[PDB]
Design a protein around this nucleic acid. Structure first.
Ligand SMILES: [Mg+2]
Ligand SMILES: [Mg+2]
Length: 540
DNA sequence: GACCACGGCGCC
DNA sequence: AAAGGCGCCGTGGTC
């Protein structure tokens, strides 16, 4: 096949590499190679050879860049065929799949991976010709974002380990109180972590009424939704609900996170997966830092563990109602656009009609209720499902659905146009032309078809919000470098940065402006910003 | 030790 | 606490 030539490769070569494990912050670089111009070059010693590359160009380029950064080398990621394939079709999420589909095989040898990266890029680049909008997304968003993501991953975030270890002991004792009480109420001990055993106790032994069934295997459900509805049926239910919350938080965050501190950085390093979702969102794994608790009292105590470096502060920026602002722009609805242009709070307007009075002081709970209905109607829930899900008579539900769409006729028209076009072309698109293929828009099984319609009109909204955030990160990153600040985390419509204390206020101002002005829409974008020593404080 | 499907549930 | 989009936990089961 390719001609074998000595290391190092010429500039522009495609790289292949093998890691001992998937997480580049934790991986041993086992082998490194490069392919170009009909030649393949294999590195005698991979870590040393890393020093010869100017760019990581090839499949999974960002992963190699993260390892390089870990080793003190400023090796940026460049072209990556994964990103081309993901823009053609976001179900293209793995190198194994992308290779099979576009002209090779993903193996475990660096030379082969290098040669593969080269051929896949050639082929996929050809596919993106004529695709002007996908090309722009590649050049202006995805390719530059991979470098930003590489820096975020390699930087990591600081965690108060001692605090979490002390917290574990406290939660353990509370969990023991709950499980002892549950077993007494049951009349015998069992495995409270087993939903199958819990099912027998609740519905067979205590004879509580089963309310719902599980999706795939049709067992009587013990989900929080069922338990909430049985809260007053028996005192064991509230205890179980509390046990669920504590064990969830303890097993997922409190116990695992302290063990994941990197020995060299003394920080926690997530992976930001760039080709993992059907809508263009990022995902986070190993550990997932996009789902750190924030709602409950114990969740808030966990979030306080994420702290700024000594002498630095966290800066937290959140887009306000990005998805509804995107929907206003996509649909062109005059009335919805007027809402945002006039700084009015849409969920409060709906809370004036329902729960009113008063317009001035609707109160939190009623607004949360109005929000729930606004989005419910939006996702095409029936007057029946809304009336029963939201403890209100059937008539009220219908009235609100008609009002909602009489106020925003173009939102309805936009949803209808998007579904028809998805059916015809087989895909739907974000504002920037990112695509998702949704085949089941024609299924003859109504539950299947209707689930598809929800996916289909969700994608342009969630996906455009993702495009905007990604473009914002791409724009914001060089500015932070210049100011000596760091970008740490993204959580879909939020960013968390770290800045020296003397510069935190300027960083927050600047970041807020870059985010709000990322790509002007028919409505303003609003960003709320907070500064603090820890992630919870930085929003309070 | 690993994988899996599942139910369940943390976040946006 | 908006929940379509995710990733992780333990169970029960397999290999
Ligand atoms: Mg928010
Ligand atoms: Mg699942």
């Amino acid at each position: 096949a390719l001609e074998e030539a000595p290391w190092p490769p010429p500039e522009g070569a495609f790289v292949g590499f093998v890691l001992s494990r998937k997480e580049p912050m934790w991986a041993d670089l086992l082998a490194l190679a490069a392919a170009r111009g009909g030649r393949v070059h294999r590195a005698p010693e991979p870590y040393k050879a890393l020093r010869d590359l100017k760019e990581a160009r090839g499949l999974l380029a960002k992963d190699l860049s993260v390892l390089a950064l870990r080793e003190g080398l400023g090796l940026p990621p460049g072209d990556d065929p994964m990103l081309l394939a993901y823009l053609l079709d976001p179900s293209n999420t793995t190198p194994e799949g992308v290779a099979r589909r576009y002209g090779g095989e993903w193996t475990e040898e660096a030379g082969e991976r290098a040669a593969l990266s080269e051929r896949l890029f050639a082929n996929l680049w050809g596919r993106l010709e004529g695709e002007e909008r996908l090309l722009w997304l590649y050049r202006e968003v995805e390719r530059p974002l991979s470098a930003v993501l590489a820096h975020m991953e390699a930087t990591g975030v600081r965690l108060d380990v001692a605090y979490l270890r002390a917290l574990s002991l406290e939660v353990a004792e509370e969990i023991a109180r709950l499980e002892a009480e549950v077993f007494r109420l049951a009349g015998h001990p069992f495995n409270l972590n087993s939903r199958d055993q819990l099912e027998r106790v609740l519905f067979d032994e205590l004879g509580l009424p089963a309310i719902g069934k599980t999706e795939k295997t049709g067992k009587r459900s013990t989900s929080a939704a069922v338990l909430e509805a049985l809260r007053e049926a028996h005192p064991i239910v509230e205890k179980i609900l509390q046990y669920r919350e504590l064990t969830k938080l303890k097993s997922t965050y409190i116990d695992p996170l302290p063990d994941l501190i990197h020995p060299r950085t003394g920080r926690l390093h997530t992976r930001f997966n760039q080709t993992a979702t059907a809508t263009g969102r990022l995902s986070s794994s190993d550990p997932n830092l996009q789902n750190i608790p924030v709602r409950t009292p114990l969740g808030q105590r966990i979030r306080r563990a994420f702290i700024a470096e000594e002498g630095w502060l966290l800066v937290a920026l959140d887009y306000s109602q990005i998805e509804l602002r995107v929907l206003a722009h996509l649909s062109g609805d005059e009335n919805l656009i007027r809402v945002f242009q006039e700084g009015r709070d849409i969920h409060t307007e709906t809370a004036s009609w329902m729960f009113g009075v008063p317009r001035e002081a609707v109160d939190p709970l009623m607004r949360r209720a109005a929000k729930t209905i606004n989005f419910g109607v939006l996702y095409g829930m029936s007057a029946h499902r809304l009336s029963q899900e939201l403890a209100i008579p059937y008539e009220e539900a219908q009235a609100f659905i008609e009002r909602y769409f009489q106020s925003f006729p173009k939102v309805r028209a936009w949803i209808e146009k998007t579904l028809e076009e998805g059916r015809r072309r087989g895909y739907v698109e974000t504002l920037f032309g990112r695509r998702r293929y949704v085949p089941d828009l024609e299924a003859r099984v109504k539950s299947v078809r209707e689930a598809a319609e929800r996916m289909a009109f969700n994608m342009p909204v969630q996906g455009t919000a993702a495009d905007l955030m990604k473009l914002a990160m791409v724009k914001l990153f060089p500015r932070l470098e210049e100011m000596g600040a760091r970008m740490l985390l993204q959580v879909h419509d939020e960013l968390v940065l770290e800045a020296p204390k003397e510069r935190a206020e300027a960083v927050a101002r600047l970041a807020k402006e870059v985010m709000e002005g990322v790509y002007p829409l028919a409505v303003p974008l609003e960003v709320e910003v907070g500064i603090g020593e820890d992630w919870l404080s930085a929003k309070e």
